[PDB]
């Protein structure tokens, strides 16, 4: 349905995809959903899931936020994609940019991302940027953090079943961004 812009093959065999599309149609295992501590889903991936998934969707997020308590800084929780093409989606508390440790936090909240989604053997996530925007990071630091996250996660857990990662963008701006910081990976 979409259109693949970048791929990068990683040597232990993920392939990291730029894609630009709406976030919410896309098919994949997980679909994350940078959020804060209270779940809140205002935001602009918020948005367009509860565009796509309506009240199934919100009915998943309220459940969650009652089970899970409040959602610390760096921390991921799951609610199933009830209503998305999405099995899951990963909501996400990024660190605001400035915060005392904001980049190794930004760091953990992707790799807390990918742990969830190998706790339920998925195959595919699809991450927007996250960090950047909403919670202040610069773009280009934002991008070099994640990518550098996920390359680290990947040559650290061995049994990983997540075959594609997807950087779903939508302006130009951060698909050039997303596209050099990627194009820095395994590429020797
Ligand atoms: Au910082």
Do not use: R, T
């Given at each position: 349905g979409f259109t693949v812009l970048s791929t990068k093959s990683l040597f232990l065999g993920q392939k990291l995809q730029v894609v630009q599309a709406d976030?919410?149609?896309?098919?994949?295992d997980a679909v994350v959903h940078p959020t804060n501590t209270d779940f809140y889903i205002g935001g602009e991936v918020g948005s367009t899931l509860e565009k796509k998934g309506g009240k199934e969707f919100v009915e998943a997020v309220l459940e969650l936020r009652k089970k899970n308590g409040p959602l610390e800084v760096a921390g991921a929780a799951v609610s199933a994609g009830?209503?998305?093409?999405?099995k899951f989606v990963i909501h996400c508390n990024s660190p605001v940019?400035?915060?005392?440790?904001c980049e190794e936090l930004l760091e953990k909240t992707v790799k807390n991302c990918l742990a969830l989604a190998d706790d339920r053997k998925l195959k595919s996530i699809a991450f927007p940027s996250?960090?950047?925007?909403r919670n202040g990071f610069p773009k280009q630091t934002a991008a070099q953090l994640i990518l550098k996250a996920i390359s680290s996660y990947f040559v650290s857990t061995?049994?990983?079943?997540?075959?594609t990662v997807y950087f779903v963008l939508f302006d130009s701006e951060s698909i050039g961004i997303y596209v050099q910081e990627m194009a820095k990976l395994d590429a020797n």
């Open positions: 976030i919410a149609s896309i098919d994949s009830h209503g998305l093409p999405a940019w400035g915060s005392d440790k996250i960090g950047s925007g061995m049994s990983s079943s997540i075959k």
